[PDB]
Amino acid sequence: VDIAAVDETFKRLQSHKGVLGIIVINAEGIAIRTTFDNDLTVQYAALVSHFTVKARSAVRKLDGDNDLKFLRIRSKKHEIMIAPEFERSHEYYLVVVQDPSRE
Amino acid sequence: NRVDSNLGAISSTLLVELEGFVEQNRFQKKQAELLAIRNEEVR
Amino acid sequence: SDIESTLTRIQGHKGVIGVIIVNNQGVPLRSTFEHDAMTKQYADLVPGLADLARNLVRDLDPQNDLEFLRIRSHKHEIMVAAKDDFVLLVIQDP
Amino acid sequence: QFEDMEAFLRVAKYTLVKFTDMHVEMKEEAMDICITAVEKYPNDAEKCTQMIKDQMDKKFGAPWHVVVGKGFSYEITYEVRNLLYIYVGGRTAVLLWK
Amino acid sequence: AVIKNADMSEEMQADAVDCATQALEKYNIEKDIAAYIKKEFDRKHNPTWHCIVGRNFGSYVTHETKHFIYFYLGQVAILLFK
Amino acid sequence: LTDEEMDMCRKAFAMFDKDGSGTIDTKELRTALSALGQNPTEEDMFVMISQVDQDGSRCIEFKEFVRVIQINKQMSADTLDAFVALGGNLDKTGRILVDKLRSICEEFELTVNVDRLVKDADRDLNGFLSYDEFRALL
Amino acid sequence: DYIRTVVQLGSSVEDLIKQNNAVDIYQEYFTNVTMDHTSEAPHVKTVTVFK
């Protein structure tokens, strides 16, 4: 069953070095799978939802025929990675948090 | 030093300090000798 | 003569189409473009994204800050180095 | 120079008033009743605001308005000499206007 | 749009939702959101409003008979009243 | 509003509340006035504090300190000093008397001076200086 | 459709995470090195000659 495939993708990603977290959030800002506790989850979901719709509106405004498949914000602690796939019937901006300092 | 530790401290002084302002007069006696003294060595 | 040499190196690689420096509020100073109908576009669209992202990062744990940011579109890689004085932009398709 | 959230919460027990237009006795009574509200119910904050403005409702003014929270924004129109904005516990913050 | 609690005429509930959504679309900070949502509705209908925008806030407030609105958009929350 | 005014405000607030109370009480204020020579009543100082005390404390603090410095300063940078140099004694007339400059060079007893400056700062080429060409002199 | 999207994004991000572990870009050499080896030859200065 493909549920084993997506959970396997979580261990594929999460087996990498330093990867603190993986989470999936849909267009209505509600997380679906987690890896964190519940409140760091909901504050990521709200913040990243608003930020990525602003960034996509920025890129679409800047050029009409160009969209984004990628987003990468930096800390001094952890490099949040956002990926979105803007489509109909699905738009699931998955977001990873990682850093190469650990381990 | 002898020709430019003087002449970059002679231009570093502050004559007037912080009626009774006659003390300033007395104060401006003192540093006068200062510049005179310094000038002599450069001369 | 180090800042301008780095500008001249960085503007002559295989994909770079524009380097921009913009101040706190605005005033894009030292662009690199043969016309200026789209510099102002960058200068008034992008630092909203830079400080909005500093809000997103810093909100979590206030010892934290933001340093850089990348947005990779289909045909562009908008890299912004935001900090306190200014916002800096480099545009490049890989 | 503490090095986590937790040592910050060890230090941050003060209740700094961010901005306020209140009399000194006004300020001390309102400040202490809000700290007692926040210590009384950390979990459910709705009934903290229950207690704060219903005490201020019976005693001080017929209209009152309390907002407690974690992260928010606001723009209100308020009659002067009756505004309290304080930071409680180093995290939770409370706006209070008539 | 999501509404959790309101007691007011729906014909200006539509006014509230169309006032808030274009505001949220336009600006990119959340103080000016609570600025605009009051300001433009203030020049529309009445002299007095109050409006809160954020996440995880608590409040007790005296209602108004036909002016009390508690929005919800995209894990961003709005309150406004008279 | 600026950043060094906060420095001088902190130093002067240190000077007034000299014991360390964190609040200006009446006795330290009278100590400051008595160091300046004044020993007024114990009813006018009450009214003075009551106008400056906003919080009802009977003791004024740093916010009130800078409030009074703010109102008195910015209510009433380089315009005034260069302006009132000599032309601001003339108040938007652009004609400065030569006799004022002769008096200035008279009183300060200066050893050697020729007034060719006013001869060679003459930009209207009449024998006087308007204010814009006066700044051009400065 | 949700499953297909998630595995598509997992593939792309997996490439990205490798990209960040490959060589670290954001790392200034000698961020904080205090020990400096310098020039310390003897200096003779005549402050004044007392004559």
Swiss-Prot record, chain B:
Signal peptide start-end: none
Coiled coil regions, renumbered to chain: 22-43
Protein's recorded name: Dynein gamma chain, flagellar outer arm
Subcellular compartments: Cell projection, Cilium, Flagellum; Cytoplasm, Cytoskeleton, Flagellum axoneme
Self-association state and partner proteins as the record states: Consists of at least 3 heavy chains (alpha, beta and gamma), 2 intermediate chains and 8 light chains.
Domain comment, as recorded: Dynein heavy chains probably consist of an N-terminal stem (which binds cargo and interacts with other dynein components), and the head or motor domain. The motor contains six tandemly-linked AAA domains in the head, which form a ring. A stalk-like structure (formed by two of the coiled coil domains) protrudes between AAA 4 and AAA 5 and terminates in a microtubule-binding site. A seventh domain may also contribute to this ring; it is not clear whether the N-terminus or the C-terminus forms this extra domain.
Disulfide bonds: none
Encoding gene per record: ODA2
Main function: Force generating protein of eukaryotic cilia and flagella. Produces force towards the minus ends of microtubules. Dynein has ATPase activity; the force-producing power stroke is thought to occur on release of ADP.
The family this protein is said to belong to: Belongs to the dynein heavy chain family.
Curated annotation (Swiss-Prot), chain E:
Keywords: Cell projection, Cilium, Cytoplasm, Cytoskeleton, Dynein, Flagellum, Microtubule, Motor protein
Cell compartments where the protein resides: Cytoplasm, Cytoskeleton, Flagellum axoneme
SUPFAM superfamilies listed in its UniProt record: DLC
GO CC term (a single one): microtubule
Coiled-coil residue windows: none
UniProt key word Zinc: no
Alphabetized CDD domains for the sequence: DLC-like_DYNLL1_DYNLL2
Record has Coiled coil as a keyword: no
UniProt-listed GO biological process terms: microtubule-based process; motile cilium assembly
Gene3D superfamilies xref list: Protein Inhibitor Of Neuronal Nitric Oxide Synthase
Principal location: cytoplasm
PANTHER family: DYNEIN LIGHT CHAIN
Protein family according to the UniProt entry: Belongs to the dynein light chain family.
Subunit structure: Consists of at least 3 heavy chains (alpha, beta and gamma), 2 intermediate chains and 8 light chains.
Protein name: Dynein 8 kDa light chain, flagellar outer arm
Organism: Chlamydomonas reinhardtii
Curated annotation (Swiss-Prot), chain F:
Residues at which Ca(2+) 2 binds: D53, D55, S57, C59, E64
All copies of domain EF-hand, residue ranges: 4-39, 40-75, 109-138
Protein name: Dynein 18 kDa light chain, flagellar outer arm
Subcellular location: Cell projection, Cilium, Flagellum
GO molecular function: calcium ion binding
Subunit description: Consists of at least 3 heavy chains (alpha, beta and gamma), 2 intermediate chains and 8 light chains.
GO terms under cellular component: dynein complex; microtubule; motile cilium
UniProtKB/Swiss-Prot annotation, chain G:
Location(s), subcellular: Cytoplasm, Cytoskeleton, Flagellum axoneme
Domain of life: Eukaryota
Function (record text): May play a role in regulating dynein heavy chain (DHC) activity. May function in holding IC78 to the DHC, or in stabilizing the entire dynein complex.
Assembly and binders: Consists of at least 3 heavy chains (alpha, beta and gamma), 2 intermediate chains and 8 light chains.
Family in the record: Belongs to the dynein intermediate chain family.
Name listed for the protein in its UniProt record: Dynein, 70 kDa intermediate chain, flagellar outer arm
Gene name linked to the record: ODA6
Positions spanned in the full protein: 105 to 155 of 567
